[PDB]
A = this chain, B = another copy of it.
Amino acid sequence: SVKPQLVMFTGGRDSTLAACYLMLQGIPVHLWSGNSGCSLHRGILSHRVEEMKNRFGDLVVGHTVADISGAFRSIAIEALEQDILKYRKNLVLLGEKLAIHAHLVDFCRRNDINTINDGITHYQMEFPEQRLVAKTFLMEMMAQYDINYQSPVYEFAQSADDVKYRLLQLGISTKSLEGISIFADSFSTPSDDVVLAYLREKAPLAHNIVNFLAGETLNPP
């Protein structure tokens, strides 16, 4: 046995492979999925979890679906007017990732987990949060709470096709069985400077939410 680690798991190919690759090494994974409250057609996720339990047994130690709608709202939606007028870009989905990270601090500290993993693989332009500017920021944030952030399947596959057929060799389906954010395809591409500035602007809020969830303060930042 090894100490379980957490995987940020959406049901997509890439995070599926991340979890699978960990488990192939004997590393038990706690699958963690954030529900932001604006995600549609999330039913299929259960089919993917089933496939993974079938192939790896006990190594899937559990699947947590967390309601992060409150943190998401506070970080990304309450000041949507301000946010879009300032950055000229809809960064709601970036805010959601910050909300995920706040929740993960709480989850990790309450469940004795010190390693989290994500599904970064080959390069994907659509996801600003997979950029070094954002991942550096997020890694820093998690390290302030002594949480180790890994990307175990980084550049392990060259392309989406490489991810699909590695999963097929594992006896798992190639599809991305994830819910769809209502904000999918609802934004244009931001610069790295807008990404970093947004993360820095909302960070105080995220940290405050972390403190609230730990029972240390009610007061705003």
Contact = CB atoms under 8 A, between A and B. Distances in A.
A133 interface: no
A71 interface: yes
Copies in the complex: 7
A84 B80 CA distance: 9
Contacts of A145: none
A175 to B, nearest CB: 7
B37 A169 contact: no
A186 B44 contact: no
A67 interface: yes
A143 interface: no
Nearest to A220: B162
B47 A173 contact: no
A175 B90 CA distance: 23
B37 A165 contact: no
Contacts of A26: 215
A125 interface: no
Contacts of A44: 44, 47, 173, 175, 177
Contact of A81 (B21, B89, B165, B216): B89
A166 B80 CA distance: 18
A176 interface: yes
A88 B85 CA distance: 7
> Which residue among A26, A41, A183 has the maximum number of chain B CB atoms within 10 Å of its CB?
A41
A77 B183 contact: yes
Contacts of A37: 38-40, 182
Given A44-B173, A174-B184, 17 more contacts: A24-B215, A26-B215, A37-B182, A44-B44, A47-B47, A70-B169, A78-B165, A78-B185, A80-B90, A81-B90, A84-B84, A85-B85, A161-B185, A162-B220, A165-B185, A168-B180, A175-B175
